[PDB]
Amino acid sequence: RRACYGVLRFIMESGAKGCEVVVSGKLRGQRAKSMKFVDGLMIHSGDPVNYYVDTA
Amino acid sequence: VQISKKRKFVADGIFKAELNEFLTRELAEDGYSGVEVRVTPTRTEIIILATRTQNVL
Amino acid sequence: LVIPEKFQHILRVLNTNIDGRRKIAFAITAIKGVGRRYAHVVLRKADIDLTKRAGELTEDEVERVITIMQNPRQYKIPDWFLNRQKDVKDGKYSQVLANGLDNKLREDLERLKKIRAHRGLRHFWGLRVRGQHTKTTGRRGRT
Amino acid sequence: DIKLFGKWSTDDVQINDISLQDYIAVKEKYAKYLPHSAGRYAAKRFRKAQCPIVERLTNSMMMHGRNNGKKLMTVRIVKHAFEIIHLLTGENPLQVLVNAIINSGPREDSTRIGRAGTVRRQAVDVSPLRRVNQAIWLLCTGAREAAFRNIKTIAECLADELINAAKGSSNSYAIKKKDELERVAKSNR
Amino acid sequence: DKLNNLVLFDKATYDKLCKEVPNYKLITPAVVSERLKIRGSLARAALQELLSKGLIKLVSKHRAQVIYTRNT
Amino acid sequence: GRVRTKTVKKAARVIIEKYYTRLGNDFHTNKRVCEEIAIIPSKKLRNKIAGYVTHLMKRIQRGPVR
Amino acid sequence: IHRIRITLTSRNVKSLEKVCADLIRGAKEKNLKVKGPVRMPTKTLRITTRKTPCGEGSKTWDRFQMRIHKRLIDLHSPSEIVKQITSISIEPGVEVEVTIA
Amino acid sequence: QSVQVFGRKKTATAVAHCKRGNGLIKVNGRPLEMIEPRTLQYKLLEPVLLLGKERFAGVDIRVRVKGGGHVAQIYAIRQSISKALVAYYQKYVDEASKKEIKDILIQYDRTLLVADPRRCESKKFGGPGARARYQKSYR
Amino acid sequence: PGVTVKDVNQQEFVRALAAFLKKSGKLKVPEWVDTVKLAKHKELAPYDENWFYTRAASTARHLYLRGGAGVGSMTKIYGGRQRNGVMPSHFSRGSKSVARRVLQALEGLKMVEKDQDGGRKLTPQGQRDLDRIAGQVAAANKKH
Amino acid sequence: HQQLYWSHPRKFGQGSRSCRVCSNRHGLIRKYGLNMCRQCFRQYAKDIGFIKLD
RNA sequence: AACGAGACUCUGGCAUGCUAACUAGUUACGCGACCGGUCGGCGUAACUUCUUAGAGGGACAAGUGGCGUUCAGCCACCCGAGAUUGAGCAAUAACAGGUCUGUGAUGCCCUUAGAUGUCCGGGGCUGCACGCGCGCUACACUGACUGGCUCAGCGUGUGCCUACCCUACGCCGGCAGGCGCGGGUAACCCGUUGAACCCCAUUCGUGAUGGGGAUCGGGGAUUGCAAUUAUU
Ligand SMILES: [Zn+2]
């Protein structure tokens, strides 16, 4: 939680119009949940996904 | 011997895919971002991008 | 193309009750060992028109088309037409007709059953021989 | 000026019924040299009222699966039928076509209402466009069903029902279905 | 029932072929086979001599259809 | 059907409200001025703004609009 | 020298069109007989794969494409000048092949 | 002194050459009667059986054609004959005669001047063609 | 009255040319005419026992309409649909010796010659009689 | 064991080709000289330049 | 206010307007050939209609008339190439869905030298009393056969390891094929991609027939190291 918040506050301070960080796995326990650390705007559909949102 | 135009543009791609995956596996904990391959008639230039270059060389 | 009168309605050739009112090329097909392809070649070798039916044929041209089925190789019918090209016993080129087709393929089959082979035994069980799958098909007549 | 297959003219063709006048084509400007037109009649509702009914009969002639694309096959079937019709009657062979389409379509159908296996229908009217649609269907399947395992060709079997529907005979397959489609319709009413 | 027909010319049916076949107004290889009880090849070929006889008009010749009418 | 979403209607409303003197009734000269006033990502949106403007300028002669 | 032929190929089109326009402009400014940029047909490289890695669901295929665009520009010019203006149009993605008659 | 127009169906492109001549209309160097689907000979001959031979007595038409099939090349030839005569009457006769040709050509069938724009859809995975889907089963 | 091969329907022109080649006599008819099928897809031997003259006519006419063809192109001309079993049908080619013993049979009447590009084309002496018989078939349909 | 173990003729066939990144032998794309798995092609497709347009 | 919808991106359709074409042509001119015709036969020039592919246009419910609290919009019609082309991408939240047999992704466990590694040889994965699914060929006359005629579009092609091809043309063969001999890393060659139904003629004649071809007996030929449980 703290490690995704640090990255998210850095990449929102640096002027990106919005971001979204997801950490999936068994971060605590034996059943494996996910996370969703999101902020700002975020486009999913259409053709501007190719040049406006940068995924990794 | 030369090669087809269909093969030359696909073999050009698999170069930069293996190059990039190798440099990912190498410099993933050195802040690596990507590569940029520019071909001159003299040489083929490969530009590595990184966060802190001065701790990569 | 007038009314015929000497109309041999049934031709008894090679112990077969063939038609007499079919065409002259597709009447000979009704014996075993002659298909639609072989009869045309023996009729063209006999120099008879194929417009005619089977009942207006004079007996000279009735016997001269049977005698080119007992030994076709004198009349330049090539070897790739024949029912058995390279026989396994005598190595002779012949076209086996109706009296001896069963009497030949029985000996071909039981030749493979004395030898105790992968094909004669497969014939002896009654299953499929040429390497077909046998799970889902061939169910008709089987219990 | 415009004769179908260059021989049969359209000026003396006379539609009888007022119910089918605005829907059955050629008398005036739907006169074509051939039934093949390749036009976009299915692009809107009611647009196929403005197509020549010779093309309607040609198009419904090719219904079964082995003949589904063959239009040049069915246009010569209709052309060869329009000789046998003229020989067996002696008049223009387009007046008999509208006499067959007028006569063959039912005028009272039954609409199906019930449950799974329960049938309790009820009689309704028949729109004249559905009368034209079901005229050509019964004619063409009568020609199709009575030429199947038979020495008679399709051109004779089409013509010998296309006149028998004009005469209103009950040996034709078309009028045999219309009177039963109205007989089971009156039976509820 | 099955169709027993005749492959060649009969003495009696050849009389039927020569006088009312020019009195039909529609002669076609699938009506002659049905009326006189013959096969289709007699209807196809025996009719084609009547064109040479000059007794029967030829309307239309096609692969799958042959239409003959009588003269006058 | 052919309903104009909030993008076309919002853009058309602001471009009427600011540039009413240049807009008239012809859709074509409306399109030639709507591509010089505004910076629209191109034509299939440009012709939809200019068509609601051409439907909206006829609505101003008959009285105010809400 | 007759038939100095410059072959230009890229996967994208705007950069290839930019390089081709700059080459014909830089050749026309030296007053050379320059044949126009001819456009050989566009070849599309299709590869259609199932989307799934295992083989389980609803038979959804993919449709990938690489398009290769090819031009030629032909020059009736001597060889000692042509190797100058092509060497300065250093742009990525576009590949130059020069042949002499 | 010459016209070149194109007619067009699904894939066929018949390109008609109209110069001042006598009236020999030729498809690929052969007469209109000998064109092999003769079931549609009247479909081929509609723009000359409509407007008469006298409106074609001053031209000479050599139609080339390639692409498509037989029916699609018939509907491309007769479109280019019409579109060639109309363009000849516009380029070397007046507009009035072009109108008096064009109204009869449009009144018969509009596909003698306006191209038919429908082409084959694309196959999709999941079925045998564009719209049709593979048969599915249950349980 | 300038007649060429294209000014008449070909289905009768081939019959005319076959009758002319049959009446000439000096056409080298092979030995296996009364035994073969013309391709590997046709299931029977052809009906007309003079099939070689009709075939040797239509090979020459396809050398009229476009020359430069050889035995490989003539295999693709005379190819059809192979109906094969319970598997779907497929286009199969013709023969390469039935289509080759016609081509050097037309050399036997010196009606063709091997062109410099590789295939076979017509000689001007062989372009004489094709137009002659095109005139002879275009002059015997309109008067009768 | 010298004329042996890597002895069998692997001059063609399914098990003389393998993926160039997986070294796996199944589901192989040999077209245009890719020689990748059908799964490893889909990972590196946009790097090669195969864009999904339609 | 934000996302998803829409916009967007590719594709289809239009342009005698622009840009240009010996690796696409048409028209014209001579030559040649056979009767002013026919040339996919030969070389020059006018040029881009046809062919290519780039920019830019073009369609917006814009026009007319009805109906809508005269609003959003719907319906019909003119003019039009066109008055919904077809796809791709696709939210939040989920599932005890599939995948450890795609990975040198990977936690735990099992095994690690008569090995659960790995190679070699031979089998099996195809085995059949029978159930259940996707399909191909059909049951014929709107047809089968044998001739004749005449039209496509999307594509692929000499390979790092790597052996492995598209093939014109001449000869020998019924044919499957076999010899040479050329072209092509390709808008240059196969290729004018001389496709199949379709179209035009002959035969067959409502019968388990010449429809239908399963199952089988003999030969012949390619592919391979190997063809027997039939590779084709
Ligand atoms: Zn892989």
Strand order of the largest sheet of chain G: 2-3-1-4
Q: Strand-residue fraction of chain G? A: 25-35%
The end-to-end distance of chain F, rounded to whole angstroms, is: 24 Å
Structural class of chain F: mainly alpha
Terminal CA distance of chain G: 8 Å
Q: Structurally, how many domains make up the residues of chain G? A: 1
Radius of gyration of chain F: 11 Å
- Shape category of chain F: globular
Q: Tell me roughly what share of residues is in helical segments of chain G.
A: 10-25%
- Tally of helical segments of chain F: 3
Q: What class do helices, strands and sheet pairing of chain G give?
A: alpha+beta
Largest interface: D-H, 14 and 15 residues
> Strand tally of chain G, please?
4
What overall geometry of chain G do the principal axes of the alpha carbons give?
elongated
Main sheet makeup of chain G: 4 strands, antiparallel
Main pleated sheet of chain F: none
PDB class: viral protein
Keywords: Translational Inhibition, SARS-CoV-2, Immune Evasion, Human Ribosome, viral protein
Entry title: SARS-CoV-2 Nsp1 bound to a pre-40S-like ribosome complex - state 2
Chains A, B: 40S ribosomal protein S3
Secondary structure layout plus pairing:
The structure is cut from a larger assembly and holds 10 protein chains of 9 kinds.
Chain A: H1 2-13, E1 18-21, E2 37-40
Antiparallel strand pairs in A: 1-2
Chain C: E1 11-13, E2 16-18, H1 38-45, H2 59-70, H3 98-114, H4 120-124
Chain J: E1 28-29, E2 36-37, H1 38-43, H2 45-48
Antiparallel strand pairs in J: 1-2
The structure holds zinc ion.
Zinc ion binds at residues 19, 21-22, 24, 36-37, 39-40 of chain J.
Chain I binds one RNA strand of 232 nucleotides through α1, α2, α3, β1 and β2.
Subcellular location (chain B): Cytoplasm; Nucleus; Nucleus, Nucleolus; Mitochondrion inner membrane
Family (chain B): Belongs to the universal ribosomal protein uS3 family.
Organism (chain B): Homo sapiens
Structural features:
part of a larger assembly; 10 chains; E: 72 residues; alpha+beta; 4 helices; 2 strands; globular; I: 144 residues; two-stranded antiparallel sheet; two-stranded antiparallel ribbon; 5 helices; binds zinc ion; RNA-binding; Small ribosomal subunit protein eS17 (chain F); cytoplasm (chain E)
